[PDB]
Design a protein around this ligand. Structure first.
Ligand SMILES: [Li+]
Length: 188
């Protein structure tokens, strides 16, 4: 009953009993993934999280937690496909769990600049953020075919799908990410 479902991408694999769970690291006492979820809920009514480790912890703030399919496809695209297979609704706005400062006009500006494309993603002036992406339903079959072919590359897929970057270079530092605990300590 809403147009775009927000999705926090909180990683997968744990391809050695995980290691740090980045989405659960705390920034000012609140888990990084919840900073992203709260920023998505400012702009969207329906927000879910894709998480494959510590699921009961991710379930604690009351959002639906979606796990990756048993296919165990690689990379961020696997979480996108698993969410589209488990959620109805024509559009998704994905965002990784490590970009806590995303702006309240993310969905609006991606939608305004979509210009007929089935997928658009953020460019911050210096680099593409292809996992911060507004994606139409019609991508689901193409994504399934690409991952079943053994591919993983995100930007290559977003280009194959006919997407384009949307310029958010005027949003100073809204797209900074926390790569490690060492980086997180400098943002407290
Ligand atoms: Li653990």
């Amino acid at each position: 009953m809403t147009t775009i479902t927000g999705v926090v991408l909180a990683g997968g694999k744990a391809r050695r009993m995980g290691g740090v769970d980045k989405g659960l690291l705390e920034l000012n006492g609140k888990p990084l993934w919840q900073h992203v979820a709260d920023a998505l809920m400012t702009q969207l009514s329906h927000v879910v999280v894709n998480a494959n480790r510590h699921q009961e912890i991710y379930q604690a703030s009351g959002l639906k937690v979606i796990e990756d399919s048993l296919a165990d496809y690689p990379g961020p695209l696997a979480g996108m496909l698993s969410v589209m297979q488990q959620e109805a609704g024509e559009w998704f706005l994905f965002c990784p769990c490590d970009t806590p400062y995303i702006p309240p006009d993310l969905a609006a500006r991606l939608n305004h600049q979509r210009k007929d494309a089935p997928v658009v993603w953020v460019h911050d002036g210096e680099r593409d953020h292809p996992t911060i992406a507004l994606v139409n339903r019609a991508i689901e079959p193409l994504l399934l075919e690409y991952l079943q072919a053994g591919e993983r590359r995100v930007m290559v897929f977003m280009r194959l799908a006919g997407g384009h970057a949307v310029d958010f270079s005027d949003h100073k530092d809204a797209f900074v990410n926390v790569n490690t605990p060492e980086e997180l300590a400098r943002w407290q």
